[PDB]
Amino acid sequence: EVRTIKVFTTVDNINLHTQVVDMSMTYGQQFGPTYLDGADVTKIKPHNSHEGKTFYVLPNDDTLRVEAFEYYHTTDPSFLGRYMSALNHTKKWKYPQVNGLTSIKWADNNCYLATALLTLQQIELKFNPPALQDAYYRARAGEAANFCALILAYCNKTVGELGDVRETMSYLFQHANLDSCKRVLNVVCKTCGQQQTTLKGVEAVMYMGTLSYEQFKKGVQIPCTCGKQATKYLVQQESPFVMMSAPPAQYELKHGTFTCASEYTGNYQCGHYKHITSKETLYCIDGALLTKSSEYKGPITDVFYKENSYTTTIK
């Protein structure tokens, strides 16, 4: 006797594809790799309770390939398995509201994710993939599991792996609309003369080598090919924020002079991030944990500042 149930397959959890499945064959035999809200059911045979449920599958026909690209803006063939593998864990994390922002209770080396998430809620940024638009709206409301699993997938990180905040923000900015961001730099060498450069988009909002936006406006010393140090300084900025990054070093954060920052304690192989936000006072958000202080010093790695339009007075 042949028993069947109706189920729906999907790549985006919006467009559904009706299937009739044979209860005597695994999902994998019928669909390939198959997931039920992040759980791998490939090796499982259909259960009566599955009738009418939605299963994720891999994009295995042209209809699904188009739906997956339009939703996620990737064609990496391992993306949906990585997204589902992460979601099976992130759906069990907790997302407390801390000082009015969605955070993440510590689990699985997720500190870098927590500080990224907290940062996004303080800067003006809109995502391009519908998957991130939809998941980020859910995360602002407090249900951040899908957004966190998407960050893991986009960044090619698994649950439990040590991530870097700067690199994570780079990936997130790469799928955001920063097209009207522009940065003009001047590099002055006493031997070689001056060279201006213009940067756009993600490169216009990120700098690696100093935490201080004021120092970047005055000049920072960098190597020249002639062997002298040259001075690099900001000529013109058009963006709604800037991100200044450096290897971790002791640094003073002064109330009212930055938006938010990330602190890293540890070494190359293992460590822990915390988040500092400048509000009515300095709040230090460490996953679920919250403390306050009027002054702050620690091993800071990234600082975010508000911007709109800046033009140098340096001639």
Binding residue (CB under 5 A) for Zn ion from 141, 192, 208, 289: 192
Residue 191 touching Zn ion (CB under 5 A): yes
The entry of Zn ion, Cl ion, none near residue 305 (CB within 5 to 8 angstroms by kind) is Cl ion
Instruction: Report what 127 binds from Cl ion, Zn ion, none; CB cut-off 5-8 Å by kind.
Output: Cl ion
Question: Catalytic site residue 272?
Answer: yes
Residues that bind Cl ion (CB under 5 A): 126-127, 133, 136, 258-259, 305-306
Q: Could you say which of 14, 66, 226, 289 contacts Zn ion (CB under 5 A)?
A: 226
226 is in an annotated binding site: yes
Name which of 41 and 101 has its Cβ closer to Cl ion: 101
**H-helix or E-strand spanning residue 172:** helix 165-174
Q: What is the 3-state secondary structure (H, E, C) of 202-254?
A: HHHHEEECCCCHHHHHHCEEEECCCCCEEEEEEEEEECCEEEEEEEEEEEEEE
Which of 50, 89, 111, 260 is the catalytic position? 111
Binding piece for Zn ion, criterion CB under 5 A, among 7-15, 33-41, 66-74, 191-199? 191-199
Q: Is there a catalytic annotation at residue 284?
A: no
With residue 135 as reference, give the H or E element that holds it: helix 130-141
Say whether 164 is catalytic. no
Burial group, residue 249, by CB count within 10 angstroms (0-12, 13-18, 19+): exposed
For strand 193-200 and strand 182-189, is the pairing parallel, antiparallel, or unpaired?
antiparallel
Looking at the Cβ atoms of 111 and 189, the one nearer to Zn ion is 189
Annotated binding-site residue? 189: yes
126 contact, one of Cl ion, Zn ion, none, CB 5-8 Å limit per kind:
Cl ion
284 annotated ligand-binding residue: no
Contact 159, 113 (CB under 8 A): no
CB of 305 to Cl ion, least distance (A): 4
Single-letter residue type at 134 = D
What is the number of H-type helices and E-type strands within the chain?
9, 19
Residue 224 binding partner per list Cl ion, Zn ion, none, with a CB distance cut-off of 5 to 8 Å that depends on partner kind: Zn ion
Contact call for residues 10 and 56 (beta carbons, < 8 A): yes
- Closest separation between CB of residue 217 and Cl ion, Å? 13
Q: What gap in Å lies between CA 68 and CA 86, rounded to an integer?
A: 18
By CB under 5 A, name the binding residues for Zn ion. Answer: 189, 191-192, 224, 226, 228
User: What amino acid positions are annotated as catalytic residues?
Assistant: 111, 272, 286
